[PDB]
Design a protein around this ligand. Structure first.
Ligand SMILES: CCCCCCCC(=O)N[C@H]1CCOC1=O
Length: 171
């Protein structure tokens, strides 16, 4: 207790994110922070706009293969807002039925697979890349202001994931 205990939590995480030594452990930590609360399932999305290759996206998740196949098979990346920087009008996204009011075949399938609500972030960097994270939760309960201690920590997790993973990946 010294008016700075939240700064010290940030300092502790900054040290841990540097000690990862890999992009894999950087993202794995932020997803383990969801699993530690027994939420449901976790997800990362990453994109490398390389000039030497055709442009590509990578993504990681503990989701059921029936959702992961169905999402890929119909190419739900075309209709999902969690990868579209224009929807992040204050740098952040929240799941309500209103947000999914066009993405109804995303929400109905996600609801069935156990992704009963979720939480989402984005960042932009002058060094390049782009990246996103989202936690799902089996608690079908409302998103208000998310919860202040989660809403700030989410902006921290997206910053440090994008920062640590960018400085490891360079693309
Ligand atoms: C192939 C899976 C990619 C993982 C990245 C998240 C994609 C996803 O499942 N999004 C849905 C899940 C329910 O709400 C959404 O916006």
């Amino acid at each position: 207790m010294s008016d700075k205990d939240f700064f010290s939590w940030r300092r502790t995480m900054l040290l841990r994110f540097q000690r990862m030594e890999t992009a894999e452990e950087v993202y794995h930590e932020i997803e383990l922070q969801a699993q530690q609360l027994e939420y449901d399932y976790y997800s990362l999305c990453v994109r490398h706009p390389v000039p030497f290759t055709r442009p590509k996206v990578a993504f990681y998740t503990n989701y059921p293969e029936a959702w992961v196949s169905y999402y890929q098979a119909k190419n739900f990346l075309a209709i999902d807002p969690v990868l579209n920087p224009e929807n992040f009008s204050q740098g952040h996204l929240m799941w309500n039925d209103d947000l999914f009011s066009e993405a109804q075949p995303l929400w109905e399938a996600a609801r069935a697979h156990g992704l009963r609500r979720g939480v989402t972030q984005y960042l932009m960097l002058p060094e390049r890349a782009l990246g996103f994270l989202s936690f799902s939760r089996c608690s079908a309960r409302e998103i208000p202001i998310l919860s202040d201690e989660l809403q700030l920590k989410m902006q921290l997790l997206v910053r440090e994931s994008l920062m640590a993973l960018m400085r490891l990946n360079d693309e």
